[PDB]
Amino acid sequence: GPMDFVETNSAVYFYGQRDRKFGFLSNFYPCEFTDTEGRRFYSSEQYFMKRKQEMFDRDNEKVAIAILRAKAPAVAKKLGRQVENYDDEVWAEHRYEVMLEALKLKFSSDEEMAAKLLATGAKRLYEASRHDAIWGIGLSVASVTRMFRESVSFQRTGDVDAETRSLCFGKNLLGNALMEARAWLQPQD
Template identity: 35%
Template sequence: MIHFLALRHNIDPTFTSFRLAFIVRRRTLTKNWDTYILSNTYSTMPPTSRRAKKNSKSKQEQKRPRSPSKSDTEKVSDSSQIVIDNAIYFFRPKEEHGYLSQWYASSFTDGTYSYENAEQYMMHRKGMLFAPDSPITSALLETTNPRDIKSLGRMIPNFDEDVWKRERLNIVTEGSRLKFRQSEALKARLLATEDKELVEASPFDRIWGIGFGAKQAPMKRDKWGKNLLGKALMTVRQELQEEATSDSVDPAPKLGSRRDSMGSQHSSEMVDALEEQHPPVRDIGVLPSPTQTKL
């Protein structure tokens, strides 16, 4: 027992010193490791921080209102020019200015046939031009839906592209003429457009329309289609404007007209009134000359 205690007494200092040395060594290693970690962290941080600064800068630029560039100024000036031009864009019959559409419901007659819309008139005239005896031409008078009418119009036999190109604008102009002349309400609305350009903003049609919608039309003006429907409408409008101007001028009364007879009546009444105030000199015969007078 004494030997064991003596042995333990000898071992404890050794173990204690070893333990202290281990603790010191561990602390040293830990400190060195922390230093290593920190040094590596700081060495890799600059790229990350630069990226973060770049991202924060881009976010600030996004929030900051951008000053208009030269191209933006040019775009604004182009838009202002379109506003100055003040064109009227139309397409579907139920949209704004839809009364200008071929599909707009408006009954009129050409003296022989009755039509429910200008599209029906155009396609029936097309059928009469190429196949007057065709059942399709007859069916065009019995169909009032513009979409069905358009489909039937594509089925007309004996179609000749060159002939149609020559006649189509005159046909559509005449249909628009009948449409607006036979409706005082539509006539007034057409005249209210004054001298503004009428444009069918159909993105699907570059012949009767321009091939662009109303939003893209001002920026694509150099790429517009023919706009034949708009031109036909402007032709009819000009005719109506000239008629309205001639009617507003007070013409001279025609001989035999009611105004002429009323004017004659007033003139005779004025003559009678003057005669009452100043009676005419009666016939007193021939007065003797001074040489014939006896003193």
């Protein structure tokens, strides 16, 4: 509903796989794709978590199987939080590009999903997750809605300004990765 996203002329603030319009931007959104080696994934979430286990605990049979079986994205996530030999410095260096790969597989798997991401044009994309300030901005959709309502200027440009983003928003690695996937999906002829 209207309380589940903010959309302006220049921005989309989304959260969650359920919204009928923007649900597809969520990494929990159900889909189906295969990697080159032929493993099957049912969300971008699950693939990202498999690549985390592969990076830190590659030979762990139980954990590899459990992630490949984790069709429920929240189960994949929790397994990902439990991956052993985790090194944050190393994951922080590599995790954006892993996510961008996940998104390339996901959006490549369905032309309708691809068309939906392209239909967002050049709008800036932000995951409005209150609890995730790495993949999202660490604010809820309601919080963002109050920022807009109290600012005639955000209302005029359709987005919060860069200084505000630098002080108020988390890293939004997902929104950034989606905008890079969207660029990658642009027609080349």
